[PDB]
Symmetry: C3
């Protein structure tokens, strides 16, 4: 009864001070929406990030979840790959299924 369609889902983990840079990249590519998980902690190649220890909550690591059509993955990584060469963080690309492609594509 409810048809499912393929989509991609990015999990972008980075320092909160770079939130605007990441969301601007998403908005420019035509990404329709995103969800942000705040105050994260994590282990990186050069030390620990402890969200609870930050004096400014906006400085803690964040995870931006963005469901995007496959066509947007390439242009998005063109922007994110060079950012990650200069700053901490990672992007994980997932395959997902959604019920409403029009909510995610245009």
């Amino acid at each position: 009864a409810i048809k499912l369609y393929p989509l991609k889902k990015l999990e972008i983990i980075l320092e909160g001070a770079h939130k605007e840079f990441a969301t601007d990249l998403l908005d420019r590519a035509g990404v329709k929406g995103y969800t942000i998980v705040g105050n994260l902690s994590g282990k990186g190649s050069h030390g620990m990030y402890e969200g609870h220890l930050m004096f400014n909550e906006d400085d803690a690591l964040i995870m931006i979840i963005a469901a995007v059509p496959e066509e947007l993955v390439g242009p998005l990584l063109e922007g994110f790959q060079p950012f990650f060469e200069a700053h901490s963080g990672v992007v994980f690309v997932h395959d997902i299924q959604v019920g409403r492609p029009i909510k995610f594509r245009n």
Copy 2:
């Protein structure tokens, strides 16, 4: 041994948590996890939001989406379906 399951991520406004968890309960979902205090961008609006995570057998997907359909046609929110594997002792 690895077994296939479907993992749902159901993102919606916290005000509708009770409806969503009751639906999961009524469908026979065995357990769920809730990620709170989320923010985000959606169709006409910036944001409390929550994300409910539920791993279910593939057979439960269709009936759950049917149950969520009237809600999602009237309210903000998204559902992402993932193919995952879970390990169970042999």
Copy 3:
């Protein structure tokens, strides 16, 4: 840009056992992990209503760990004695990454 396959674990457990799980990941050679705090849940991750049960008052966390496929087996074997005594679960995802060297 080429993408390369990798696995991604989402380990859900009580925040009280954070150190056990992170020590197990470090020892197995996992390069990094992300911790999502202040989670809550209800029900069980076991085969039935009673097994590996969580209540709304339990403080949970989710540990996200991108790992090479070869580490999945040893990590699940490592978490097995823990999950017979404590509630929680490991969801294994397929993911694609640009830099597999950062993770393997």
